[PDB]
Each structure stands twice: as C-alpha cells, then as structure tokens.
Design a protein around this ligand. Structure first.
Ligand SMILES: Cc1cc2nc3c(=O)[nH]c(=O)nc-3n(C[C@H](O)[C@H](O)[C@H](O)COP(=O)(O)OP(=O)(O)OC[C@H]3O[C@@H](n4cnc5c(N)ncnc54)[C@H](O)[C@@H]3O)c2cc1C
Ligand SMILES: Cc1cc2nc3c(=O)[nH]c(=O)nc-3n(C[C@H](O)[C@H](O)[C@H](O)COP(=O)(O)OP(=O)(O)OC[C@H]3O[C@@H](n4cnc5c(N)ncnc54)[C@H](O)[C@@H]3O)c2cc1C
Ligand SMILES: Cc1cc2nc3c(=O)[nH]c(=O)nc-3n(C[C@H](O)[C@H](O)[C@H](O)COP(=O)(O)OP(=O)(O)OC[C@H]3O[C@@H](n4cnc5c(N)ncnc54)[C@H](O)[C@@H]3O)c2cc1C
Ligand code: SF4
Ligand code: SF4
Lengths: 389, 379, 262
C-alpha cells in the first residue's frame, strides 16, 4: 500500500515499463515474476507472487506483413522478392498479405505495391520520413503494433532493415532471426520455421519463436523471386497517425553519399574473374572486366600473363601468387597447373571456360564449358542482365 | 616445455605481427635492396619487441627468457633478417649494458636502443681472432683523461647503421684472456672508419662490415665495468646470444617444415599426391621429430636461465644441435619441393641460404663441441 | 570520459571450414579469438583515449570463464578495466536475453558517455544484439559505422550504406556498432601483456548484478534454436551443353541462380 513512489524502480523491469497508464507502478500485462523488484523498493513493496509466468493467450491474431524499402520514394527490388515468397508465406497459413510503407509523399508506389501481389497496404506520408531514420520508423512502426497487431513481420536484409529489425524487436518483446534463407509454416501449430545460415555459413539452423507474437525476420536479398505484377487486385489503404514530438528522433542526417568503389583487392573480393594465356592479347581483360563489373569483383591473372607482360604481379594467384577464397571464380583460358589450382581450391564454386577439354582445370570445375572464351564470355553477360541480376 | 599463460599471449602477438608485417612484397625488396625498412624497426620498438627481457625497472618490458626465445622463433620462422634486427638490442647490445654498466650509462645508452632511436653493434671478431677471441690484437691504452685504441674488427653486424659500438680491446697485452676490457665507442668519433659492406650468402637485409680504429680516443667514462673484466663480460653475454642463434635455428626450421608439408600435400605426380608416397611421409616424420626433440632442448635451456641456474652447457647444446639439424631440415625441404624449390620465388630457397651461418657464427659447432666436451671431461 | 565496449569471444570461423564427408563439423578444441568487429570498436575507443587523455575504457562481456583470456588481450591492447558476466542460467540464450543481461551488466558501473559494439559476430551472424542493447536502454543507435569522430559533446559519424554512406549527428550518450572498414586495430605490447595479466578481473553472477535469478538466458528466451544441420555439397562437376553459344549460357546462368544468391 505505501508505495512511496520513489521512481528508482523503472528501468530494471525487462520490458522497460508498465508505467504511465496514468502512473508508475500501475503495472499489468508484462509482469514476468522476474525477481528484480524483490528488495529494490526501500520498504519491500509487492511481496507474493513470482512463480507464475504470463502464459495467457488470445495470442493469435493474423498478420503477414512485408516492409517496403522506399529509397528516395522508390520500391527497392528487394521488396518484390519479399512480396514474392512472402505472399506464399501468407497463403499457407491463411491470412492477408499486409504491407507497410513509410515515406514523405509516396503516392504511386501505393498502386505499385498493391499490384505486385499485396492484399492490404499501410502508408505514412509525412515529410518527416523523407530520409531514413531508426527512431522515426521505430516509433512509427511500434505505433502500428498496439493497434493492428500482426503475427508475422518480415524485413529486408538490406542495411536499412537490418537496423530497423533488432530495434523493433526489443520493444515488442518478440523473437527475431538474422538474414534468412527459406521459410515455411508448420501446418497444425501455427508458427513459422525460420531457417538461415550461421557460423560463417557452415551450420544451418531453423530457429523458431514459440512464445513470441509477432514473428519477425530479416530475409536475404535474392533468395525468393518476384510475384505476379499488375493484377491490380484491390487495395485497402489504411491510415496511421505520424504523431511526431518535440525531439522524439535523435538521429539527424547531414549528408548522404553515393560512391563508386572501383579499387578492390583480389583478396577482399567476393567474385573473381581470372584470365590466363588463353587471351592471346593483353586486351582480353576488358572482357573479363565487363564480366567482373556485373558481379562486383576484380580480375586476377596467372603467371603466364605476368611473365608475358599483360598484367602485374599484384593480380597473380597460386603458390607464388596470392590465395583467394571468393564466392565465385572464373577459370578462363588457364591450363590448370597445380601452381595455380593451389591458390583457389576452396573457392565456393569454380566455373571453367577452356577451349581444350583435356585441361586439368575441369577436375575442380563445378561447372564447365568447352570453347573459345571470346565467344562464351559475352554470351554469359547477355543472359545475365536479362533476369535482373 | 610448459608455457606460462602470458607467454602464450606473447606467442600470439609475435605470430600475428611477424606474419602480418613481413609480407612477400617486402621481403623480396629486402633481398634486392639490402636495406631493412626503418619504418618496420620503429614499428617493432613501439610494441616492445626491442625490449623483451629487460625489465620495467629499467624501462623494458618485463618478460622472461622464454619470451625472448618465443619471439625469436616466431619471427625467424617468417624472415631470417628480421630475427637479426631483433636479437641485437635484446641480447647482444643490451647484454653487457645490463651486466657491467653503471646506472648513468644505462640511462644514456640502453633506453635509446629499446625505443629504436639508437643502434648498437657488438664488436669482438678480428681477422686474426675468430674462434680464438682471446688472441685479439686490438689494443687499448690508458692516457688518463681518455683511452686510446688501435685495431680492426671484421664481420661486425649492423655496424654501418649503428651509432655506438661495444668494442673489446686488449688493455694488458701480457694477460691475454685475463687482460681484456670493454668500451663503448661512438662510431662517429675520430679515427673510426668502416669497411665495405660484405656480400653474404643470405640474411641479406642487414649490413655487415669492418670497424677500423686508428688512434681513436675514447673517454674513460665510457668503459664497461671493471678493467680486464671484458672477456667474462663477453662470455656471459655470449651464452644468451647463443640461445638466440639456436632460437632462430628453430624458427626458420619450423617454418621450412610448414612449407614442406604444405607443398607435399598439394603436389601430385603419379595420380597420388606427393605426401602419400612412403619415402616422403617418413622423411617429413624424421624432420618433425628432430625439430621437436630439440625444440625441447632449447626451451629447456631458456627455462634454466630463467630460474638462475648456470645454463652454459645447456645453451651450448641448444645452439649446436638446433643449428645443425636446422640445416639438415632446410635441405630436405628443398628436396621435397623438387625442382621448384630451387627458384627464388619459392620461399624455401631463401631459408636454405639463410640457415647456413647458423652453424658458424656465434662460435662454430667446433667451438661448441669444445665447450661441451671440455665441460664433461675435467676429472 | 567513460567508454564501454562490448567484446565477444568467438570461434575462429575462418579455419573451421572442412569436415569429414560423414560429419557434422563440431570440432575438438577450436581456437577462440576476439570477434573482429569488436576489435575495431575497441580500437576506436583506444584512439579516443589516445586523443582525449584521462578517458578510461571499460570492456565487458558475457560467457564462460574461458572468455577471461580474450579480455586479457583487450587489456594488453590498452583497455583500462575488464568485466565478465558468467552464470549457469546465462548460457544458451537468444539475442533478447543476451542483450538484456548485457545492458543490465552495464547498468552497475560508472556511467558511460559512449558505448561501442561490433556490426555482428562471426559465430551467430545476427547483427542484432548491439541495437537491442541500445534501444533497450533508450539510447540512439547507429550501425554500420565507417568513420567516427566525436565533437566534444555530440557525435558525428559515417554510416556505411550499400552504395555509399550517411553522415549523421547524434547526441551523447548513445550506442553505435562498429564495422571493420573503419580502422586497423593496434597490436598488443609485450609490456601490455605483462601489465594485463596482473590487473584483476571483476566477475559477476545473476545474484551479483542485481538481476533476474529466475528469467535469464535460456529461461527468458523468445527465440530458441531447434534444428541444427549441415548444408549439402554439390560434387557433380558435370558440364553445361548446348547447340548455340547463347543456349549454353542460359542453362549456366539459370542453374547458377536457382539455389544461389543470384
Ligand atoms: C617457380 C614457378 C612458380 C610458378 N607459380 C605459378 C603460380 O603461382 N601461379 C600460376 O598460375 N602459375 C605459376 N607458374 C606457372 C605454371 O606452372 C603454368 O606455367 C601456368 O599456369 C601456365 O599458364 P596458364 O595457367 O594460363 O596455362 P597456359 O598453358 O599458359 O594456357 C593455355 C591453355 O589455354 C587454352 N586456350 C588457348 N587459347 C584459348 C582460347 N582462345 N580460349 C580458351 N582457351 C584457350 C589452351 O587450350 C590451354 O588449355 C609457376 C612456374 C614456376 C616455374
Ligand atoms: C637448373 C635446372 C635445369 C633443368 N633442365 C632441364 C632440361 O634441360 N630438360 C628437362 O627436361 N628438364 C629440365 N629440368 C627439370 C628437372 O630435370 C625436373 O624438374 C626434375 O626431374 C624434377 O621435376 P619436378 O620438380 O617436377 O619433380 P616433382 O615431382 O615436382 O618433385 C617431386 C619430389 O618428390 C619426389 N618424388 C616424386 N615422385 C615420387 C614418388 N613416386 N615417390 C616418392 N618420392 C617421389 C622427388 O624426388 C621430388 O623431390 C631442369 C631443372 C632445373 C632445376
Ligand atoms: C546457430 C545459432 C543460431 C542462432 N539464431 C538465433 C536467432 O535466430 N535469434 C536469436 O535471438 N538468437 C539466436 N542465436 C543465439 C544468439 O546468437 C545468442 O544470443 C548469442 O549469445 C549472441 O550472438 P549473436 O550472433 O546474436 O551476436 P551478434 O548479434 O552478431 O553480435 C553483435 C554484437 O553483440 C555484442 N555481444 C553479443 N554478445 C556479447 C557478449 N556476451 N559479450 C560481449 N559482447 C557481446 C558484440 O560486441 C557483437 O559485436 C543463435 C545461436 C546460434 C549458435
Ligand atoms: S519500487 Fe516500490 S516504491 Fe519505487 S516505485 Fe516501484 S513500488 Fe513505488
Ligand atoms: S518482475 Fe514482473 S513486475 Fe517486477 S519487473 Fe520483472 S516484469 Fe515488471
């Protein structure tokens, strides 16, 4: 009774509050019988409870929600994938596929995101959301939780979502997974089987959140694919408030920069196009330079070219050269001496392009193609952009 | 032996460092241009590798001998010349200062070389005096306000890069081994002149020449300890130095072996890989067991030094056995590499050349055997 | 000033790549290193110490007593005070519990002006714990830090974006997770190690930090790992065929997309 209202015991509670439904220690739906507030009150206030947890349900509402990255008010292609197999996600358990969008004066993307497959779409046209901010959408999406509480909340593994997601999870006291690979729904227990690679990609794990509503997960860009666009089904554009405060967003942006990173080390790269004496002329690297550019990696060389004068030693790979462990390697016109194969054996996948089929490189080639690279290489770039990288 | 948990950390440090800062690109440039990059030396002193066994009482690092051997090994593995630039202030320059030096001399001389501002050469060998350092011919005369010296020193490591050099001259020409004093000489002084840099087989990056002394006057205030003690000074420095040379023997050894099993795993000839032919695998074994056997030899020597028992025999064994089986190892590693181990691009050839002095300098293997047998046969 | 850095000891994921063709790759004795991005964060704080004198750095962690040694490394680099969190209940917890006990372990020290962490740790690959500690403590959070420079009372920073970066101003106190692109962490010193092993480490428990005895670690864990399996190898190095020069490319690129990041 004599709670003296000391206010010292506010933040040690694990959900930070329960305080101000007009008052501190006016608690309710989040006491987890933790035992932090046992003695921290000067006069031993509330003292008999604690072996009870919160498992009180009605915890099953719907909601399959896709966030829309809106770079400069434009849907980022990542959302077309997240709407691709996320609509699949919504269908198996049975629920609408809701979407949230937060921008400044976004008007046409409403119809775009409606057309690409989403049933329902939420919108926040407040010029205060012109740029990206972790508290703005934090508070703005946290606002959409108490009112339209969903069950599934998806995100993009892009640098925007991978910052929004953990911050949003801690306040709602739910569970989250990292950049995920593929998902499903266990048909009888309604929950989501989240799968992702961890341990640098050496141990896959299906992490699940049983006592957590909603279920959220940043999903990797490129794993799913696009859905059908422009059925122009409907829309139910719903409103949220965008009720900003007098300094309720401490992150403030000075400048945004867009660089063109052209310097990149053969050791740091994630994709490599290597060329050997199968070029004949030093000018071949332009071709491979074209190849490397659609992928975002560098050109490497073998000794034959260096000792011929077509390249510098910084580029060479093998026992005398430098060792590479990319995510992809292009073995173009290289005999295949162990003096080379030694320094790339652990490339996650090796693709070979040689004229003569009796070249050793096809021993570790994951995929092989026989021919002249000057014809094969350009055709590879053709079908490359034709799907959308 | 058994490693103290701090020494395991130091092992980690010297590993990441020596591996990271001594790149192929650099080491190749050191062989071509016999000049080690001052920037790297500064970088080393900044984390104290120049001050391993000297205690914080004098502004050192407070490590034990095992930490000096650990750093010596892990550096020398990656590059020989690096080790040379490492042992000098730790053992050969900082030894006699640490023993027979007054507090003033240590304030003005030792701390500079621990921080990498000054460089100090240990100069004992003469053209007439090699193994028989007692048969010196450099003279030192007492004039009252200064000492006057007249002689010549061959094979003086780092000397053209050095600012002062501890030089051993004969004071009492009649006493011989009993009549040698040790002096600190500013190499910039009068009379002092340097010979040509010697073209050596390996360990290229560190210059090595003669120190010529022509009526050079040295003040009395720059003499090492007592008069006619110089010889015992140099011996008791030479024990920890020999521990150094065995230390680098074991370093480059473990390295050339690591390159050995690497090439033998990767190369294929008859469909099998090299390492699955019995001759090779057994050869690898043989090299490995000697190397370990004797790692245990030298580790043991250094631990004795750390617990203050005389290590004069144990160190001599360490230098002898370590350097010799190092050469055997280096060669065998060439032979595993086959033809390719004869081209300079394959690191094993630089090792093979480096590891050869190890049985000569710091006292030959013969001088080592003389010390050891002479210690076991006295009756 | 007081700068607290959250460093985690982790298994070296670089070397542990190989496994038997009949084996779930959990090895016998794997080396435990300081998570690289944490090394970057600690370096940032060490440069603030290098520039602003008299600024003491507090490094904290949660895990087993084996993590103690990594803390020593941190101290040999130049850190001031080390703190470890270990308990029978702490182990086997998700990012929510881990962040909760971490921030709670922060709350009981000399109030810090700046808190630093890493983008993510190579063993869980979650990149969540830092931001959850930040917002759980009602602070600003700025991840992907590429260049950090504090202007004597508030922070202006770079945010590494996929195509660039965002210069951002933030009021202290705050938490910002670091990334390896921004600095070259310094080595230890031979003297740093010796002085590091003598400085004592203060170790707390679930009954020491004034926390939940009942609901930490595995007990209060919203996310729980269920399946733990390996990813399959492909093996078949069978070529791509075709009639036409372009016909081959199609099958190459299409197979290259299906079950791939393309
Ligand atoms: C000490 C030493 C160290 C060495 N270290 C290395 C090292 O680290 N790395 C290294 O790579 N090498 C190294 N070498 C050399 C190595 O052994 C080979 O000589 C080298 O790999 C040959 O170059 P290449 O691999 O491109 O094959 P090459 O034989 O030079 O290339 C010819 C191949 O390309 C094919 N080809 C020709 N024209 C075309 C075309 N138009 N389209 C497609 N295919 C075509 C040919 O059919 C053949 O398969 C070293 C050699 C020595 C002596
Ligand atoms: C200066 C020089 C000049 C040369 N001139 C010529 C020349 O004019 N003409 C020419 O044709 N060649 C020449 N060569 C090449 C040289 O003769 C061959 O390289 C030599 O036969 C060794 O070849 P390799 O290094 O490839 O052997 P590798 O097979 O690469 O070496 C394998 C190593 O393991 C051992 N080994 C190999 N197979 C087995 C096995 N089954 N079981 C156990 N151990 C095994 C070998 O002893 C060797 O040490 C020259 C080489 C040099 C260095
Ligand atoms: C295979 C696997 C999958 C997992 N999947 C999930 C999942 O989907 N969801 C989930 O919630 N949990 C998951 N976990 C558990 C989660 O990893 C633990 O909470 C773990 O202790 C934290 O690792 P992390 O990957 O989240 O760290 P990260 O979030 O990657 O680390 C970010 C930063 O947190 C700081 N940090 C974290 N822990 C400590 C600490 N103890 N001491 C100091 N600094 C620290 C570091 O500075 C680091 O830079 C998984 C664990 C495993 C092994
Ligand atoms: S702790 Fe006891 S006193 Fe302090 S607020 Fe909560 S109830 Fe009121
Ligand atoms: S125990 Fe229940 S009430 Fe006391 S803090 Fe933890 S949650 Fe809030």
């Amino acid at each position: 009774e004599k709670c003296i209202g000391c206010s010292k015991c506010q933040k040690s509670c694990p959900f930070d509050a329960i305080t101000i439904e007009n008052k501190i220690a006016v608690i309710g739906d989040a006491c987890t019988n933790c035992g932090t507030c046992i003695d921290v009150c000067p006069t031993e206030a509330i003292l008999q409870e604690g072996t009870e947890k919160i498992v009180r349900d009605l915890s099953m509402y719907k909601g399959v929600w896709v966030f829309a990255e809106q770079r400069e008010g434009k849907i980022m292609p990542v959302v077309f994938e997240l709407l691709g197999e996320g609509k699949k996600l919504a269908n198996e358990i049975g629920t609408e596929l809701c979407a949230i969008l937060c921008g400044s004066n976004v008007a046409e993307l409403t119809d775009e995101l409606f057309a690409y497959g989403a049933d329902k779409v939420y919108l926040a046209d407040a010029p205060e959301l012109e740029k990206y901010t972790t508290d703005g959408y934090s508070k703005i999406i946290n606002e959409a939780i108490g009112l339209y509480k969903p069950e599934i909340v998806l995100y993009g593994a892009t640098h925007i979502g991978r910052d929004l997601a953990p911050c949003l999870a801690v306040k709602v006291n739910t569970g989250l997974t990292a950049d995920c690979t593929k998902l499903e729904i266990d048909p009888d227990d309604k929950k989501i089987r989240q799968t992702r690679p961890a341990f640098g990609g050496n141990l896959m794990a299906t992490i699940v959140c049983p006592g957590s509503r909603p279920q959220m997960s940043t999903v990797r860009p490129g794993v799913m694919d696009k859905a059908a666009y422009d059925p122009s089904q409907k829309g139910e554009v719903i409103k949220l408030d965008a009720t900003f405060n007098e300094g309720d967003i401490r992150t403030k942006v000075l400048e945004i920069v867009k660089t063109t990173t052209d310097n990149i080390s053969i050791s740091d790269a994630d994709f490599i196009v290597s060329g050997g004496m199968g070029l004949g002329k030093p000018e071949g690297f332009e071709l491979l330079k074209q190849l490397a550019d659609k992928l975002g990696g560098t050109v490497a060389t073998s000794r034959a070219c260096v000792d011929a004068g077509w390249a510098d030693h910084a580029q060479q790979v093998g026992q005398t050269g430098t060792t590479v462990k990319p995510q992809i390697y292009f073995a173009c016109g290289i005999s295949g001496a162990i003096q080379h194969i030694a320094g790339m054996q652990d490339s996650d996948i090796i693709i070979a392009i040689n004229k003569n089929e009796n070249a050793p490189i096809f021993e570790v080639a994951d995929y092989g193609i026989v021919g002249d690279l000057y014809k094969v290489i350009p055709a590879i770039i053709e079908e490359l952009d034709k799907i959308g990288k | 032996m058994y490693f103290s948990e701090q020494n395991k950390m130091i092992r980690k440090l010297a590993r990441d460092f020596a591996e990271k800062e001594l790149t192929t690109e650099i080491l190749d440039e050191v062989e071509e241009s016999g000049e080690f990059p001052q920037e790297i030396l500064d970088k080393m002193a900044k984390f104290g590798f120049f001050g391993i066994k000297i205690p914080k009482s004098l502004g050192g690092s407070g490590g034990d001998h095992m930490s000096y051997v650990i750093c010596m090994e892990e550096f020398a593995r990656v590059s020989g010349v690096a080790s040379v630039y490492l042992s000098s202030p730790n053992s050969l320059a900082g030894g006699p200062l640490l023993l027979s030096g007054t507090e003033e001399q240590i304030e003005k001389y030792l701390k500079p070389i621990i921080t990498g501002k000054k460089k100090l050469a240990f100069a004992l060998t003469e053209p007439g005096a090699g193994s028989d350092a007692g048969g010196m011919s450099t003279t030192a005369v007492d004039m009252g306000d200064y000492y006057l010296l007249n002689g010549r020193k061959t094979f003086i490591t780092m000397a053209p890069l050095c600012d002062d050099a501890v030089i051993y001259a004969k004071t009492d020409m009649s006493k011989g081994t009993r009549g040698i004093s040790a002096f600190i000489v500013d190499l910039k002084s009068e009379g002092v002149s340097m010979g040509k840099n010697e073209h050596k087989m390996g360990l290229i990056g560190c210059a090595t020449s003669d120190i010529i002394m022509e009526d050079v006057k040295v003040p009395k205030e720059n003499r090492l300890g007592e008069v006619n003690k110089g010889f015992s000074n140099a011996m008791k420095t030479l024990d920890v130095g020999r521990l150094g040379v065995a230390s680098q023997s074991i370093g480059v050894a473990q390295g050339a072996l690591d390159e050995a099993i690497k090439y033998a795993k990767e190369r294929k000839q008859f469909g099998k890989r090299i390492a699955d032919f019995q001759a090779i695998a057994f050869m690898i074994a043989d090299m490995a067991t000697k190397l370990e056997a004797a790692k245990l030899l030298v580790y043991n020597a250094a631990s004795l030094m750390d617990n203050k028992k005389n290590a004069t025999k144990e160190a001599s064994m360490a230098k002898f056995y370590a350097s010799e089986i190092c050469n055997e190892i280096c060669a065998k590693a060439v032979q595993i590499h086959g033809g390719y181990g004869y081209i300079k691009e394959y690191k094993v050839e630089r090792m093979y050349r480096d590891c050869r002095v190890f049985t000569i300098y710091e006292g030959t293997s013969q001088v080592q055997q003389m010390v050891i047998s002479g210690m076991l046969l006295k009756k | 000033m007081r700068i607290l850095v959250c460093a985690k000891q982790v298994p070296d994921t670089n070397e542990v790549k190989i496994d038997p063709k009949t084996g779930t790759m959990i090895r016998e004795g794997v080396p435990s290193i300081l998570n690289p991005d944490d090394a970057n964060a600690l370096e940032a704080a060490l440069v603030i110490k290098d520039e602003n004198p008299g600024t003491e750095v507090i490094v904290m962690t949660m895990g087993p007593p084996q993590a103690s040694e990594m803390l020593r490394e941190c101290l040999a680099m130049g850190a001031d005070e080390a703190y470890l969190l270990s308990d029978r209940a702490f182990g086997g917890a998700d990012t929510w519990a881990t962040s909760a006990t971490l921030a709670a372990g922060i709350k009981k020290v000399k109030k810090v002006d700046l808190v630093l962490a890493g983008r993510q740790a190579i063993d869980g690959d979650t990149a969540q714990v830092g931001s959850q500690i930040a917002q759980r403590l009602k602070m600003p959070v700025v991840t992907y830090v590429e260049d950090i420079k504090i202007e004597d009372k508030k922070a202006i920073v770079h945010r590494q974006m996929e195509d660039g970066y965002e210069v951002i101003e933030v009021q202290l106190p705050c938490l910002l997770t670091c990334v390896k692109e921004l600095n070259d962490p310094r080595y230890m010193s031979v003297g740093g190690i010796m002085d590091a092993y003598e400085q004592p480490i203060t170790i707390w428990n679930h009954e020491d930090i004034g926390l939940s005895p009942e609901a930490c670690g595995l007990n209060a864990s919203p996310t729980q790992v269920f399946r733990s399996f390996s990813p399959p190898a492909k093996g078949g190095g069978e070529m791509i065929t075709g009639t036409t020069v372009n016909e081959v490319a199609g099958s190459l690129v299409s197979k290259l997309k299906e079950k791939h990041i393309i």
